[PDB]
Amino acid sequence: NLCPFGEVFNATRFASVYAWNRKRISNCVADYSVLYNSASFSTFKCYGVSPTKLNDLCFTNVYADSFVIRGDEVRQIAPGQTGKIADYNYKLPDDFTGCVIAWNSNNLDSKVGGNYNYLYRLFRKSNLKPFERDISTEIYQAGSTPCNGVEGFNCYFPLQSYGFQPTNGVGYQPYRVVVLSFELLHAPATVCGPKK
Amino acid sequence: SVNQTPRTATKETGESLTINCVVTGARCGLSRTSWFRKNPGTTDWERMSIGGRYVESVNKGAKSFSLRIKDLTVADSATYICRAWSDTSQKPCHAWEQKMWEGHVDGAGTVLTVNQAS
Ligand SMILES: *[C@@H]1O[C@H](CO[C@@H]2O[C@@H](C)[C@@H](O)[C@@H](O)[C@@H]2O)[C@@H](O[C@@H]2O[C@H](CO)[C@@H](O)[C@H](O)[C@H]2NC(C)=O)[C@H](O)[C@H]1NC(C)=O
């Protein structure tokens, strides 16, 4: 019974990073060697686990979080990082155990004249906790004067569009990102590699 | 991550290009390297075979590596990518509390333009 990684990596639509999608993966066999040996992923970074040993390990559950960001920001999807994305959109814990997998998606997610469907959060009153998700659109009070839901001086709408175009430089091109979290609880395992 | 330099380059026919890639945050040693070229408009990257005009050097201790392309031609105009692997097969590894990675990652690319001769 194979884990449905296809539905995650080959999903027709991906989420904005601020509204990142999560899929729980349970009760299945995960062959990671096909993913790890694919030439399609320009980032495949694992923390707390060796990717060459994944087919020999079991986990309680696996979580698959996915979204789009720009190339320059893939480095923020890592334990201990800061920046707009890590601070305000998608945060990994310091003790993260899992893998971050990214690929360039200019051919799918950019459009002549600009694709504006992907957004990111620019402002927040506090940094996200690990794996916290914020999809609110409250006006951000940057000063001492209350905003009352009106954009203005020191009062900012919190989301911005990426505007992906095919002629963007690589650092500005869209990248799809899948974060696999390998959860280990004091419970029976439900996700194992083929070697069990 | 991999810091790949230069990000862009223009060369005359007959010159050489050296690309340097420096690997940062690797939990273990550099366990494998590869080089790929992409022509604009194409879907797939082409793996480069080292040994002729492509010559590679690896500095295991610095976790860096480089490629030199000899005898440049207009046919060499393209984007070039280095790919670095790090995994537990390379013996000296850092602790996990250090938030360092195993796996593979690519440099951001070198856009090479080679001008015609004469
Ligand atoms: C994500 O999809 C790729 C390729 O999808 C192919 O094209 C689609 C239109 C659809 O028809 C798929 O069924 C096709 O496979 C998967 O890569 C393929 O894997 C099979 C497995 O043996 C292989 O035979 C094909 O040659 C591969 N094709 C390519 C282009 O690489 C890939 O496995 C999918 N990812 C996940 C996580 O399932």
Residue numbers in the entry:
A (entry chain A): 334 to 529
B (entry chain C): 21 to 138
Give the authors' words:
VNAR-3B4 binds an epitope on the RBD that is highly conserved between SARS-CoV-1 and SARS-CoV-2 that is distal to the ACE2 binding interface. VNAR-3B4 binds distal to the ACE2 binding interface with no direct interaction with the residues involved in ACE2 recognition. This epitope is only accessible to 3B4 when the RBD is in the “up” conformation and is blocked by the N-terminal domains (NTD) of other spike protomers when the RBD is in the “down” position (upper inset). Alignment of the 3B4 crystal structure with an available cryo-EM structure of the full spike protein bound to the host receptor ACE2 shows that the framework of 3B4 likely clashes with ACE2 when the RBD is in the “up” conformation. This suggests that the mode of neutralization for 3B4 is through steric occlusion rather than direct competition with the ACE2 binding site. We also found that VNAR-3B4 bound the RBD solely via its CDR3, the canonical VNAR paratope. For VNAR-3B4, its interaction was dependent on only 5 residues in the CDR3 region of the VNAR and 7 total residues in the spike RBD. Residues Glu122, His124, Asp126 of CDR3 form an anti-parallel β-sheet with residues Ser375, Phe377, and Cys379 in the β2-strand of the RBD. The extensive hydrogen bond (h-bond) pairing of these backbone residues likely accounts for much of the affinity of the interaction, and because it is not dependent on sidechain participation, it makes this part of the interaction primarily residue independent. In addition to the backbone-backbone interactions above, there is also an elaborate h-bond network formed between the terminal amines of Arg103 of 3B4 with the backbone carbonyls of Ala372 and Phe374 that is supported by a side-on intramolecular interaction between Asp126 and Arg103 of 3B4.
